[PDB]
From a paper:
The overall folds of the three rabbit PrPC 121–230 mutants (S170N, S174N and S170N/S174N) are very similar to the wild-type structure. At pH 4.5, the S170N and S174N single mutants form 54% and 66.6% β-state and the double mutant sees a larger increase to 84.9% β-state. Similar to hamster PrP, both the wild-type and S170N/S174N rabbit PrP convert to primarily β-sheet secondary structure immediately after dilution to 10 µm PrP in 4 M urea. In contrast to what had been seen with wild-type and mutant hamster PrP, rates and extent of β-octamer formation did not differ for wild-type and S170N/S174N rabbit PrP.
Additionally we found that rabbits, a species with low susceptibility to prion disease possess PrP with a helix-capping motif in the β2−α2 loop, which appears to hamper the formation of the β-state. In the previously determined structure of wild-type rabbit PrPC 121–230, the sidechain of S174 forms a hydrogen bond with the backbone of N171 and vice versa, creating a hydrophobic staple helix cap motif.
Numbering used by the authors: 126 to 223
The structure:
């Protein structure tokens, strides 16, 4: 806070180049966020800087919420999470800017 919280979306279809990650995302898809936290779009000059912050904030919040419940993410989870959140952040930027 005060961060903006976007609407829940369907978790994106992503073809990971790493075949094991690709399978892992599908197997464990519900572990990952389906909404992103961000600072308002109009505070940014470009998509890249927005997404950078959106990814950091969203990953921080999801990891914090998870750890305090006594659950864990694997190294593979984190890699997949960063990519999933990146895509949702890009979608959020393009949408909210439109
Ligand atoms: Cl979903
Ligand atoms: Na591959």
């Amino acid at each position: 806070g005060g961060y903006m919280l976007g609407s829940a979306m369907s978790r994106p279809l992503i073809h990971f180049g790493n075949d094991y990650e690709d399978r892992y995302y599908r197997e464990n898809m519900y572990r990952y966020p389906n909404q992103v936290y961000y600072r308002p779009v109009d505070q940014y000059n470009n998509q890249n800087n927005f997404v950078h912050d959106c990814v950091n904030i969203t990953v921080k919040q999801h990891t914090v919420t998870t750890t305090t419940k006594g659950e864990n993410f694997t190294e593979t989870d984190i890699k997949i999470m960063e990519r999933v959140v990146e895509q949702m952040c890009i979608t959020q930027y393009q949408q909210e800017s439109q």
